[PDB]
Symmetry: C3
Subunit: 336 residues, 3 copies
């Protein structure tokens, strides 16, 4: 497109919503390319990440960890207004793995506190992609401080299996997995700091051990458990988008499966099927499609079980409906 062609395209302002939920969107594109407008503010703030009051200075897109999922269609133009409040203390930018050029947009979006920038790029490749902050010289630090999220570039005609048949989801949830590296004093307790910059040196030391202290979904242990469990019903088709901007993960739905899984997160690559556990390398997003068949509670975990049940990477799905004794049945309940 020429400058004149792009400016003439229909435009749409989308109001982002907090994860695990996703803003309203149509799976199958209606009409020609559009310029889709998103606005995100950067918030540097303290968040508690576990039941023991552990705090961390998060650098979050729209104040959440992970940042919100943005959805557009292949060949749409994503036009983002990124604002860095005069209230913040660090420079930030954004790098879309979905984009082409200038370090994913990082080289054109360096904004200091009190500045804003508007970046536009054409979403040429379909799939789910990671996006994260990446300021020269401080890349890992901003990412493992929670400054990352994902976008989804849906094919114009919606999703399809390898065979080429349509896959329509009833619900979609976005699970952002985050590895945190919280420094511990000489006595084992987690340290606290006044400002982000004060925790840098100590945090880098933990990072170099490549061993995270916490691995959580939606920014905190238990964030998606109990009453904040994701929901579904027997018969419902669910797309679960999962991202990890820095470290490997291996999602597993306990009691379920990944009927169709784009483990690489790219829609032009046929999905693997009937997966028990899939693998998403650090720096990538993936997606799993599943149709619930049994009611009850399910757990959704990173299957290095130590990371899931000790470090925090576990979420719940509460599913309603009728039990199917054909798929599974207790012939003899536990008995003497």
């Amino acid at each position: 497109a020429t400058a004149a062609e792009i400016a003439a395209l229909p435009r749409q302002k989308v109001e982002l919503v907090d994860p695990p939920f996703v803003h309203a969107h149509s799976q199958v594109a209606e009409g020609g390319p559009k310029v889709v407008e998103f606005t995100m503010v950067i918030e540097e703030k303290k968040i508690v990440i576990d039941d023991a009051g552990t705090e961390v200075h998060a650098m979050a897109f729209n104040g959440t960890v992970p940042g919100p999922l943005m959805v557009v269609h292949q060949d749409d133009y994503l036009e983002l207004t990124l604002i860095n409040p005069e209230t913040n203390t660090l420079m930030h930018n954004i790098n879309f793995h979905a984009a082409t050029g200038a370090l994913g947009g990082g080289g054109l979006t360096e904004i200091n506190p009190g500045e804003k920038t508007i970046l536009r790029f054409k979403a040429t490749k379909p799939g789910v992609f990671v996006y994260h902050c990446a300021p020269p010289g401080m890349v890992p630090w901003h990412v493992v401080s929670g400054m990352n999220g994902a976008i989804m570039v849906l094919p114009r005609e919606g999703l399809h299996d390898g065979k080429g048949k349509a896959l329509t989801y009833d619900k979609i949830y976005y699970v952002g997995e985050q590895d945190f590296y919280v420094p511990r004093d000489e006595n084992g307790k987690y340290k606290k700091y006044e400002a982000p910059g004060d925790a840098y040196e100590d945090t880098v030391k933990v990072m170099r051990t490549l061993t995270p202290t916490h691995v959580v979904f939606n920014g905190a242990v238990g964030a998606l458990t109990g009453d904040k469990a994701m929901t579904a019903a027997v018969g419902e088709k669910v797309l679960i988008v999962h991202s990890q901007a820095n470290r490997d993960t291996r999602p597993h739905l306990i009691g379920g499966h990944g009927d169709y899984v784009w483990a690489t997160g790219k829609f032009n690559t046929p999905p693997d099927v009937d997966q028990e556990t899939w693998f998403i390398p650090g720096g990538a997003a993936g997606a799993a499609f599943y149709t619930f068949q049994q009611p009850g509670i399910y757990a959704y975990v990173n299957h290095n079980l130590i990371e899931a049940f000790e470090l925090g990477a576990a979420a719940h799905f509460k599913v309603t409906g009728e039990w199917n004794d054909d798929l599974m049945t207790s012939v003899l309940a536990p008995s003497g």
Copy 2:
């Protein structure tokens, strides 16, 4: 199927055998669905895992690590009787990744010492799948204590390549890879305990470092080496099933290849081919098909060589037959 339909199905009792071997079975299903009966007893016992006398309190299905491989066909019903001897001290259950509902069957099989339970589920998805114990609040601990194994749900018509052509194996071996976390005293020596529960706290501390002390095949360093090496002959087609219920691994056959590899372990996903090294994420099972072409000794390892040659993840294949100088030949033997 209705209750009446299932109870009318032909039944078969299978006597399980110890890994790396697998019970008798037909690759191509003969007849309609069947209800396949398996019985497993849980044994909590001390096992030595290396040549230095290191001991561990294993929680093992049928007394072995890994537990035995169970084989059925897609759409068969697996009916398991699980027994927890009054002699044991902990509650145990079983979670089949092959199953649908109730946390893979874990929610319907919680049995205390002196109890038994009978669980039945329909094997709807073909492939090799992990199964492991997963009692609420103590999941990782029972798994890395060796309470895991795998099952194989063969397609009704046996295995086929992506092209859709039949793949018949002459032999099949099951290699269960286990990551152990043995506590070390203030002097570096491995600690020993009187009962399983006594080692819990110290073992959890090691688990949190995500660094295993041992990574072995068949429950011990050297378990499948020397005189317990797996065997084959030139011309023989071998299926090597590999599982890891908690941590990633990257199998490699030294001097060989993975001609066809279902790295994800699911038969409806076409296999990768001509693999030098394949990857199996923690919480999954995979399978590799290979036709031996050269006689001699081969090593089968997890290709993080430190884990293979220092930590214990190495096994041997002893292969008989005639040497093929076309594939490889020493033109000039080592000489001055």
Copy 3:
């Protein structure tokens, strides 16, 4: 082939070049099978791997880390003359993952200082494959000391996408990723040794923690940055071969993508497409094909960002050409 048939085949001597570059070769094979001759000398020498003067006793094929990439065509015979200078102190051999039998050739190439050997094998499987030293009892130590590289067995008709259409590259670069384990004294400083053997015990201790101190491309931090950056131009098709003989990696081209990626590195397995980040398990080589669309500087990294920006796994691509405002444009430059 019979002995007489092989000796009658046309022969070619290839002069190897230092990575990231690759010796001259034709992508599409011209004529029938050939016996391709390569010569490599082993050099045990001290190399500095970072800007702080950290030294390591490298064991390098042709004096570089990684060793050079050798290219032949499927069904060609690779005939290697391996020389171990009387000047060296250790026994060495070579294990090609591309080969069949005798532990990849390791069992027929054990040479002490002052000896040489000539090994020949038929390249039956197409793809990029790792090769490394593997002397009995000291395998990991020689590999993580840099004694590894890769070869590429191109299909006779060159590369093709899954669809079966030709993929011709203008340039090809070979990035060998190396995990080093340098011992640190009681004060944190990196230790130095007089001879290779002297560092063994201390180095094994670091290896067992499975935590590398450095992760670099081409044997050193910054090796492929600044003025040694790899180059390309907008419109050019580049094949980037990547190997890791011991540990997992997840390559990512910042500002770009992997248009076609043989993540497993085997050409008979269709490539994944539109990848943001791909995964290469330890003990394997992979390849990514990409067509540059935007000029500027790109970073090529292992996407565990801590390993990339803290440990050393980062390289640069300097690309010339015209900027495409359709793919990306700064609508509002950073401003108050």
